Amino acid sequence: GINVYSEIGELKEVLVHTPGDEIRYTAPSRLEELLFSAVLKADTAIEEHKGFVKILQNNGIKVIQLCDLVAETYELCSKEVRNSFIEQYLDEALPVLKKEIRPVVKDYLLSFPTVQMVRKMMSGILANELNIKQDNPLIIDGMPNLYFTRDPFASMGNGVSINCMKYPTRKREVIFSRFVFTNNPKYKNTPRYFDIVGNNGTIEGGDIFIYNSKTLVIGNSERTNFAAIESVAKNIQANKDCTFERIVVINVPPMPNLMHLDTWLTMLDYDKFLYSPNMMNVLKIWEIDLNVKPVKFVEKKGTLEEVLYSIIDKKPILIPIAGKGANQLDIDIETHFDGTNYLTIAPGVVVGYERNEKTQKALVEAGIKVLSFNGSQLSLGMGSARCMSMPLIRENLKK
Amino acid sequence: GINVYSEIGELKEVLVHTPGDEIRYTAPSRLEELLFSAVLKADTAIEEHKGFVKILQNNGIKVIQLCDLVAETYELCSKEVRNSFIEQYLDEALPVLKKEIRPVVKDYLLSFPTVQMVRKMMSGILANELNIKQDNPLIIDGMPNLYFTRDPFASMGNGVSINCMKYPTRKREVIFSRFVFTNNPKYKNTPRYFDIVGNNGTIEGGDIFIYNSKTLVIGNSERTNFAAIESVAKNIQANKDCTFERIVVINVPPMPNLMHLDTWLTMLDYDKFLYSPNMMNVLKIWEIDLNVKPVKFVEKKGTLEEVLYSIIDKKPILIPIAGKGANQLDIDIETHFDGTNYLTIAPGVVVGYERNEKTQKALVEAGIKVLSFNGSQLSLGMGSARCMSMPLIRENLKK
Ligand SMILES: [Cl-]
Ligand SMILES: [Cl-]
């Protein structure tokens, strides 16, 4: 059920999540606590996400909703496994559930049709809903970052990496997709090159890129360390079907207005890349030959061009955020709105926010086809199309 | 040219400012520096403002654009007065203009037709525009807060109060309306019950309310002190035509998110008020008899209802933000989006953001007619309708 051996191959199946009531439950004083960037006008953001989904569907892509995938898995499970799912959810809920309120929540959840129940689990629960009186409006917090399906897990060739989020507020999001990879017959046998239980280190979706059939590119950032990368390398060596033979690790230290490797660099075509004009000049890299044991990180150095050349074996076309010659104001604004994170749905065809006009212009001038959409409210979340999606199946490249 | 003896009298003439390029020049890192709340999707915010203006116009209100009023004044002035205006603008420009750049900016400004020149002054100037190469993309910062015409000056009966802003970034805004009140024949003779030159203390538009022909209500806040209120009191006593006989000063304790009286209480009808449920229970008031000299601030205490009753002489109807029984989540969100600041265009008829649904519902249930508009982007500026307008002429009440 999983086959992603590039960042650009024609997209066939992708996972997304149209936001539900959870983005209505973020108090302005809890933006940091919930690790979300702003208070959205929900109805508008939701319609905008639907616009994003529609574009993907009109391009023959099968768009799968997280809530539907979880609901489908649930229906196929035994009563004990189903209950096991509900119980784990109650255990990880925040704020922690009081003993006499837990059973009230559980009965409430079970009173809804499967898909609506899953949606309540994602949205969180208001005290009013349970007829409970108290100042705190929420019995259970919602998970506002769920529409960023790029984080809980990342497809990786024929397997997946179920990521280790940083803060507990976001670690609650993993229960859904993990339930799918554990019980859904279509994904149950997907090999896990990383999981939150039998490995070492930490790793996040933003640092994971698949350049081609043989090369995996991971960022060594503040969120992804060598320990996790080593676990991934060994798990891959133990799998016979995987075609990966090499891992290129790119050192990504904290920089102003940037974060994971994705804010630094994205791949849009066989030889076209979008990058931050404010990244470092000479990159620190680590080459890992997967055909050799034990796994060893071979340190190397080079400009972005040199590093890219060593992977695609041809001159890379580098496009800076906001285009060449842009002033710092435009660069800052379009970086702020996640300008590098366009989602590539086919070689040279991308999807992103229309507000990032300078970057859009530079992309079309370089021969890339851009399918923009209005995300006037969605964009306040600070994450673009690549962040709001997780490819499940892409047509392998013939290069 | 000025006649505003209430907060609710049928609105005949009002001053607004549809944002120009200035709201395109706010770097995300300069939100605090420019004292603005977020990075707007300019084109969208501008159309939303036009929608706001359209509603006012469709209600028979004469809407006056600040840029047009300034341009009109400029044309009527002598060459020496005109240049006097340009020079002061150049003097107050930020960042400070370099000696060799100043003359370049001046010629640039003079090369545009009058109204376009005024718009450049308001919008600020990019280095690209002058073909200058430097670090700062801006030669002159824009004044993003210009569309909040409630701040520079506040109509007060038959006169005006040209306010003393707090930070220099916003003090630059006063030059435009002041130029009008100084040279336009229609406003030239308007008495100034306060100005940035011959008085004491500080005062801001958000603290000034006109309840009726005889009562002026001013908030004693972190932005408005007794010194400024005394200056206003004396200046009013010196005017023969003014009908004000009393001033009620309400103490507004500086909270983390409270700099003016307007976000605590607004008047929407002869006996209907919108208030913040997070305000103090017992108010500290000061009664000033304008028929008495010298001016003495007579302290007094009472509940919101008691204080209001002492002014309108009838039972006041109090409507809380988000309505009665609302949970803290809805109160917090609608407070965040300036829920009290509806603009009253006639007794019991208001205009405001459609996103504040709970407050809107409470208002209609209370008998108030609400003319909402989409401000999905404008609202990010943290100021509602009353903040985006300055009544010039209101039909006097007959009560
Ligand atoms: Cl957009
Ligand atoms: Cl709105």
Residue numbers in the entry:
A (entry chain A), B (entry chain B): 54 to 452
Authors' own words:
The arginine deiminase pathway (ADI) is the most widespread anaerobic route for arginine degradation in microorganisms and performs the conversion of arginine to ornithine, ammonia, and CO2, generating one mole of ATP per mole of arginine consumed. The ADI pathway is composed by three catalytic enzymes: arginine deiminase (ADI, EC 3.5.3.6), ornithine carbamoyltransferase (OTC, EC 2.1.3.3) and carbamate kinase (CK, EC 2.7.2.2). Here we have described the structure of the three enzymes that constitute the gene cluster in the ADI pathway in Mycoplasma penetrans (together with the specific membrane-associated arginine permease coded by arcD gene) and compared them to previous structures of the enzymes.
ADI catalyzes the first step of the argininine degradation pathway, the deimination of arginine, producing citrulline and ammonium. Crystals of M.penetrans ADI display a large unit cell composed of twelve molecules in the asymmetric unit. The overall protein fold and the secondary structure elements found in previous ADI structures are conserved in M.penetrans and consist of the repetition of a three-stranded mixed β sheet and a helix forming five ββαβ modules in a cyclical arrangement. The catalytic reaction of the ADI enzyme is performed by the catalytic triad composed of Cys440, His313 and Glu257, where the sulfur of Cys440 catalyzes a nucleophilic attack on the guanidino carbon of the arginine substrate. The apo-form ADI structure of M.penetrans would correspond to the “open” conformation of the enzyme, whereas the intermediate-substrate bound ADI structure of M.arginini would represent the “closed” conformation. In our “open” conformation of M.penetrans ADI, Cys440 is located in a similar position as in the “closed” conformation, whereas His313 and Glu257 need to move about 3 Å to interact with the arginine substrate. Therefore, it is essentially the movement of three loops containing some of the catalytic and binding residues of the active site pocket that is needed to switch from the “open” to the “closed” conformation of the enzyme, namely the loops α9-β5, β6-α10 and β7-α11.
